[PDB]
Design a protein around this ligand. Structure first.
Ligand SMILES: [Cl-]
Ligand SMILES: [Cl-]
Ligand SMILES: [Cl-]
Ligand SMILES: [Cl-]
Length: 204
């Protein structure tokens, strides 16, 4: 009649959640607080972890996810030098990379690949693959020609294609093509890490 273990998941609280949050933090998955409550922010970090590790993206830290946590799984970046934002489209993560070392792994969501209509024309919600650079930024909440909602602190890398904060960053590609991250992650990129004009943005 004793209860089985807790698998940390959204809504959980307790020491095991605290330990998970700290381990994520230690491994570089973006999370600000280890407080023992598995809320929205923790969800973003768990999803980033499961994505990175190639695991089913359910937010539930069961036996397989725990094994990967214990193994200390971190993705290997493609770049070798300098500051680079890498976006892994298959895994749906953004990597803040410096000198070939991942500094942070951030949950992301990119284009859904479906058609959409805008100012009377049909487009396809593809995120481009390639080697680009931040060329402009708008430091507040702004509208998009591509995206339907507003974008928080966009950093533009090819025409209207930007990395930005969003209210929803799901476990599948959900956008019209821009790359969404949490507002907190976007603030970190801007204000703590620094991602100035000219920063390489590599998508693959
Ligand atoms: Cl919650
Ligand atoms: Cl949280
Ligand atoms: Cl999945
Ligand atoms: Cl699992």
């Amino acid at each position: 009649e004793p209860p089985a273990p807790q698998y940390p998941q959204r809504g959980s609280t307790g020491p095991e959640v605290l330990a998970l949050q700290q381990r994520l933090m230690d491994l570089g998955y973006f999370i600000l607080k280890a407080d023992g409550d598995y809320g929205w922010a923790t969800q973003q970090a768990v999803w980033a972890f499961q994505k990175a590790a190639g695991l089913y993206r359910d937010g539930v830290v069961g036996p397989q996810t725990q094994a990967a946590l214990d193994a200390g799984y971190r993705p290997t970046p493609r770049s070798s030098s300098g500051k680079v934002v890498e976006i892994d489209l298959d895994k749906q993560i953004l990597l803040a990379v410096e000198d070939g070392r991942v500094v942070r792994i951030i949950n992301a969501s990119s284009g859904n690949g479906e058609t959409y209509e805008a100012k009377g024309r049909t487009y396809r919600a593809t995120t481009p693959r390639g080697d680009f650079a931040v060329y402009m930024q708008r430091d507040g909440m702004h509208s998009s020609t591509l995206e339907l909602g507003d974008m928080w602190r966009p950093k533009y890398f090819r025409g209207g294609y930007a990395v930005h904060g969003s209210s929803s960053i799901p476990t599948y590609p959900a956008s019209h093509g821009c790359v969404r991250v949490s507002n907190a992650a976007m603030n970190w990129l801007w204000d703590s890490w620094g991602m100035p004009i000219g920063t390489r943005v590599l998508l693959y």
